Amino acid sequence: EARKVKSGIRQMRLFSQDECAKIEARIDEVVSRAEKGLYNEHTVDRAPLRNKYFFGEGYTYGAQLQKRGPGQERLYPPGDVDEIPEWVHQLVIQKLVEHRVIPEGFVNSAVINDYQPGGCIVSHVDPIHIFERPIVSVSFFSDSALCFGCKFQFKPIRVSEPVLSLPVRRGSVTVLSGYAADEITHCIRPQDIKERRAVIILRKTRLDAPRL
RNA sequence: GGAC
Ligand SMILES: [Mn+2]
């Protein structure tokens, strides 16, 4: 299963320090605008140590699901979340298309996940009924790891030993497909977030993805 | 400090 996950992982260094510093400033400006109430309601998802910023297409998850279950996550109504920022197209998405990571016109969803030290996201599969593959992630502000096949326990939070631990370094691009994207959860453990880390996740929603 |  660890070997199976490996076949679906593409990881490469793509962004330089100056490019990360420019984007990390754009991330800091996204956080500032969200704190000023200048984004649409569903653009900003707030949790104690993690903030999610949905552009282009957002999704419901977790406790926002009244009926929890496989296939229950939903996209928001059309045109609800804010459009992908121009700086995301030029700085992040044009670099990925020019380096053949994804086709042009693939990405219609750009989500920025912002983690404070000790933050996490519990094990999950990116909803197969919502998102097409592959899943592209670009990390910022610090180095961390992406873990697979972890079982979470709570009160207090405990995370089982990962099937695979993948270091995700600042400026590196992580791509998930196949088994690593479909047949096993991925997560972030609190111990792996030692400083603030942000990741811009570029995805393609399916033509049949249900909306709220 | 909680997406399976
Ligand atoms: Mn995910």
Residue numbers in the entry: 81 to 292
From the study:
AlkB homologue 5 (ALKBH5) is a ferrous iron and 2-oxoglutarate dependent oxygenase that demethylates RNA N6-methyladenosine (m6A), a post-transcriptional RNA modification with an emerging set of regulatory roles. We report three crystal structures of ALKBH5 in complex with an m6A-ssRNA 8-mer substrate and supporting biochemical analyses. Strikingly, the single-stranded RNA substrate binds to the active site of ALKBH5 in a 5′-3′ orientation that is opposite to single-stranded or double-stranded DNA substrates observed for other AlkB subfamily members, including single-stranded DNA bound to FTO. The results support a mechanism involving formation of an m6A hemiaminal intermediate, followed by efficient ALKBH5 catalyzed demethylation, enabled by a proton shuttle network involving Lys132 and Tyr139.
We modified the construct to produce N-terminally truncated ALKBH574–292 (residues 74–292); we were able to co-purify ALKBH574–292 in complex with Mn (substituting for Fe) and the m6A-containing 8-mer ssRNA substrate (U−3G−2G−1(m6A)0C+1U+2G+3C+4). Three copies of the ALKBH574–292–ssRNA complex are present in the asymmetric unit. Clear electron density is present for four (G−2G−1(m6A)0C+1) of the eight nucleotides of the ssRNA at the ALKBH5 active site region in all three copies in the asymmetric unit and the observable ssRNA does not appear to be involved in crystal contacts. Interestingly, in this initial substrate complex structure the ALKBH5 active site did not contain the cosubstrate 2OG analogue NOG, although NOG had been added to the sample mixture prior to purification by size exclusion chromatography. At the ALKBH5 active site in the structures reported here, a catalytically inert Mn ion (substituting for catalytically active Fe(II)) is coordinated by the highly conserved metal binding triad His204, Asp206, and His266, a water molecule, and either 2OG, NOG, or a sulfate ion. In the structure of the ALKBH574–292–RNA complex without 2OG or NOG, a sulfate ion (likely derived from the crystallization buffer) was observed to ligate to the Mn ion at the 2OG cosubstrate C-1 carboxylate binding site via one of its oxygens; the sulfate ion is also positioned to interact with Asn193 and Lys132. The observation of the Mn-ligating sulfate was unexpected because NOG was present in the initial complexation buffer.
